[PDB]
Ligand binder design. Sequence first.
Ligand SMILES: [Cl-]
Ligand SMILES: [Cl-]
Ligand SMILES: [Mg+2]
Ligand SMILES: [Mg+2]
Ligand SMILES: [Mg+2]
Ligand SMILES: [Mg+2]
Ligand SMILES: [Mg+2]
Length: 273
Amino acid sequence: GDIAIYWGQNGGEGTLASTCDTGRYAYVIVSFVTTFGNFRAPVVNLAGHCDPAAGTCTGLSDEIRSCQGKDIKVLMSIGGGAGDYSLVSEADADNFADYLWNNFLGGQSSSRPLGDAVLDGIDFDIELGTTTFYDTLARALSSRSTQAAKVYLTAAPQCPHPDSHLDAALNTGLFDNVWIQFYNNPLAQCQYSSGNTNDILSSWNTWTSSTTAGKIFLGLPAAPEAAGSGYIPPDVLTGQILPQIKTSAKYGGVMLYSKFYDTTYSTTIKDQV
Ligand SMILES: [Cl-]
Ligand SMILES: [Cl-]
Ligand SMILES: [Mg+2]
Ligand SMILES: [Mg+2]
Ligand SMILES: [Mg+2]
Ligand SMILES: [Mg+2]
Ligand SMILES: [Mg+2]
């Protein structure tokens, strides 16, 4: 299996190039386009790494390419838990799809936030706001795919199933990878807690058997401080959870939030994923 990791929200986490150079990750998820909708100019935030609006992130394209030359997929994530977004109409979804196509993917723009590199796809991390028109958005982005240049689509729903914000989008059948967040939902009977692997194992079965995507990933916090709840000590993960979930036909690997908190976690579990 593969490890996917979020990057971009903590300037202390190392450069994107360094993250890829570790050799531990097959996907790096750049985060986030934090605000969007109602035809307004989106805001891109990468903490202290660089300032997209200032034009100082254009140097990131050499880092994106360094990742890609190592067969690592680099995705741009929309949303996140701290942002402010919603789509107001199908036309609004078309507007935002065009923005993403032209500014991050194989389209063209004179103000690409991260430079001339072509991101491998878009990660839907829709955690708040209204639930409407994300199916519209997914379909619009997928239609920009070419046989020469694939637009990957990935999604990060919360573990309660179905996910309120992403179910309609996921039901389009257009998503390649889904990394479910088995964290921050402590009362929902779907994530790990001390002495309880029953809920997460049951939720994993529900997700794998009810989703159209071809690859499903177990999304976890990389350290106790990376989330409010749900962190799994690595020996519990590798001893009690990975061997069972890896029997699923659609097991893709593990997703981690986030690079800042992953000083030892992926290193410890690498050969069991
Ligand atoms: Cl505006
Ligand atoms: Cl909850
Ligand atoms: Mg800067
Ligand atoms: Mg359903
Ligand atoms: Mg939440
Ligand atoms: Mg028991
Ligand atoms: Mg299964």
